[PDB]
């Protein structure tokens, strides 16, 4: 971390194998942002010209490396995780005859006057070796190191700069080598025996191709409103006028979670770990209410044969709230486990138990043979081979009628049968979800209630973003939610305090860029549509505004219009013919002022 | 003589504050751009 400099129009590389000619290609990839900070390494950083060691640097979604050098002091890079021989690492070294790239379980030994030596003498369980002409060969020796989709992609470019240590020009890096490694590369280190390190981020760039297959210019679409305009129009020259290029939103600063302060835990233990189980034709239905629906207990009780949810994901049950948790507990033959599901056809679906097709819930099966499989077996079993008609969803027929044939069979299973016949205990949890009207909710840590700010909120399972304020609406004790003329939620009742809160949407609007034209000036003004200038200034100070660029926004260049807040133009009392329209009587123009 | 000038944030109407939806929306190509230009052209026409 010796020093920091700014990259200037540098680190662009060819994103793909496609040749393009005289086109402007708008693409999204991992790039070094323009004018971003790069760490300048003061030879060897912490290390001196010839010292024992140097620190390891982060490898955050790819690294840009550059160094103008004639002595070839930098002769390699190491990529890896722990770099202590417990995890495989990637070593790229140049001996000025060939470049050797290897992946092995390497031990770092502080490998680097008047001395040269071999490095990384401990190299166990080697799995990959590659040899090629040297990477390195006034010369910038620019490289981009990216590791995506298994492959470690290395790009490079060499330039002849005599008068500058960090050139101010533009060039694109060409792909050099692309290796199928499949290694994590959380962190990396440069091997010496001066250099700049930047990091890549997801970005969209407009790349200008020449008549030949080469990139001659590029614009970073997120650097400045002028670049965003250029990307929107896909041109490097912008004509005079006002353009709509993006939208702005105010992001939430904090998240709040509010659920009823219920400490009763749901009796999943008694239902799953039951002494006795229901027969096949007559499932035992219980109801779970006014409790915390903590589902980690099911995983704590037993490894499962199957845990398949249809209307919900098994991971997310501890985030959701439920209105009707019902638990149907029964024991079936293993070969029937796959048949208890929505939309299935067979003897169990039709004669013993049917599920609805619009089913929200989970079916959990666990082999119970350790308890239920005996030579005499468990005589709780009562399968129904024949039923006069198909069973309706959630219907249960306790009474047994003899067909004018004895439909019900009570047979225990021996431990010697194939597992498809051995009993499994199955619990079906029915989860009706009706937009957060109820007290059953998975375990979550409640937070404080934050008003008059743009926040994320979770109210009894209702998830959203907005500004919460004191409500003046007169809800009846029964009513919990309010909606406007368009069925958009605009009010909630706090589950712990029963306070009525109004939800106002967080500020949002269009962004227009007022450009004199790039043949006159690169100065632009930005209009935030439909917003107060106070709200915009607060969003800038709080780092909440979605677009990452900022307009200088100094005193007397912020003007409130009916169209919106105009930042980057000085309002004057001298009228003129309209040039670039803004709206509601207000126009903007590029003029000579005061001198 | 004139019509109310409207503007629609296509992504925020279809995929309001949802990254997953926005990424799925990208597979339909430039429909949001065509709608945005059509509404901008209408907005300009009303002032004309």
């Amino acid at each position: 971390t010796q020093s920091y400099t700014n990259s200037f129009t540098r680190g662009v590389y060819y994103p793909d194998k496609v040749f393009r000619s005289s086109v402007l290609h708008l693409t999204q990839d991992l790039f070094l942002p323009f004018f971003s900070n790069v760490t300048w390494f003061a030879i060897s950083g912490t290390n001196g010209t010839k010292r024992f060691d140097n620190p390891v640097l982060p490898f955050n979604d790819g690294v840009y490396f550059a160094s103008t050098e004639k002595s070839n002091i930098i002769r390699g890079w190491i990529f890896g995780t722990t770099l202590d021989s417990k995890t495989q690492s990637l070593l790229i070294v140049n001996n000025a005859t060939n470049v050797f790239i290897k992946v092995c379980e390497f031990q770092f030994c502080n490998d680097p006057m008047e001395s040269e030596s071999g490095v990384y003498s401990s190299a166990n369980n080697c799995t990959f070796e590659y040899v090629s002409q040297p990477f390195l060969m006034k010369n910038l020796r620019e490289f981009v190191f990216k590791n995506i989709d298994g492959y470690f992609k290395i790009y490079s470019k060499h330039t002849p700069i005599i008068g500058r240590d960090f050139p101010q020009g533009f060039s694109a890096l060409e792909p050099l080598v692309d290796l199928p490694i499949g290694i994590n590369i959380t962190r990396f280190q440069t091997l010496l025996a001066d250099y700049y390190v930047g990091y890549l981020q997801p970005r969209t760039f407009l790349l200008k191709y020449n008549e030949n297959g080469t990139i001659t210019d590029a614009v970073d679409c997120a650097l400045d409103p002028l670049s965003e305009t250029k990307c929107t129009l896909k041109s490097f020259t912008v004509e005079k006028g006002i353009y709509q290029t993006s939208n702005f939103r105010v992001q939430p600063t904090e998240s709040i979670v509010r659920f009823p302060n219920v400490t009763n835990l749901c009796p999943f233990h008694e239902v799953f770990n039951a002494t006795r189980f229901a027969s096949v034709y007559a499932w035992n239905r219980t109801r779970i209410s006014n409790c915390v629906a903590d589902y980690s207990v099911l995983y704590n009780f037993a490894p499962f044969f199957a845990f398949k949810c249809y209307g919900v994901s098994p991971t997310k049950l501890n985030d959701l709230c439920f209105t009707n948790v019902y638990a149907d507990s029964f024991v079936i033959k293993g070969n029937e486990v796959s048949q208890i599901a929505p939309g299935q056809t067979g003897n169990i679906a039709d004669y013993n138990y049917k599920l609805p097709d619009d089913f929200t819930g989970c079916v959990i099966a666990w082999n119970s043979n350790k308890l239920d499989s005996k030579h005499s077996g468990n005589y709780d079993y009562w399968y129904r081979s024949f039923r006069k008609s198909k069973l309706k969803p959630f219907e249960r027929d306790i009474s047994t009628e003899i067909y004018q044939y004895f439909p019900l069979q009570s047979y225990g299973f021996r431990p010697t049968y194939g597992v498809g016949h051995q009993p499994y205990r199955v619990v079906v949890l029915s989860f009706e979800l009706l937009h957060a009207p109820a007290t059953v909710c998975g375990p979550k840590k409640s937070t404080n209630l934050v008003k008059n700010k743009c926040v994320n909120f979770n109210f009894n399972g209702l998830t959203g973003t907005g500004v919460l304020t004191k409500s003046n609406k007169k809800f009846l004790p029964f009513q919990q939610f309010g909606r406007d003329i368009v069925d958009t939620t605009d009010a909630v009742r706090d589950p712990q305090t029963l306070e009525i809160l109004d939800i106002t949407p967080c500020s949002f609007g269009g962004v227009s860029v007022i450009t004199p034209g790039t043949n006159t000036s690169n100065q632009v003004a930005v209009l935030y549509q439909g917003v107060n200038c106070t709200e915009v200034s607060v969003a800038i100070h709080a780092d909440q505004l979605t677009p990452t660029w900022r307009v200088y926004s100094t005193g007397s260049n912020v003007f409130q219009t009916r169209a919106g807040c105009l930042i980057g133009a000085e309002y004057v009392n001298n009228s003129y013919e309209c040039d670039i329209p803004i709206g509601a009587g207000i126009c903007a123009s590029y003029q000579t002022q005061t001198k | 003589v004139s019509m109310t000038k409207t503007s629609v944030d296509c992504t925020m109407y279809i995929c309001g504050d949802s990254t997953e939806c926005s990424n799925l929306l990208l597979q339909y190509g430039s429909f949001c751009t065509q709608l945005k230009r059509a509404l901008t052209g209408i907005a300009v026409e009303q002032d004309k």
Binding site: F508, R562, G583 | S2, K5, T6, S7, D9, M12
Partner: peptide, 27 residues
């Protein structure tokens, strides 16, 4: 006879003001 907070229809739908105000049209 004929009848900046986006109180209604806050679903990505906005209304832009006209370039000429009612006063300018009256002028």
């Amino acid at each position: 006879k004929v009848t900046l907070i986006c109180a209604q229809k806050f679903n990505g739908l906005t209304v832009l003001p006209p370039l000429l105000t009612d006063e300018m049209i009256a002028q």
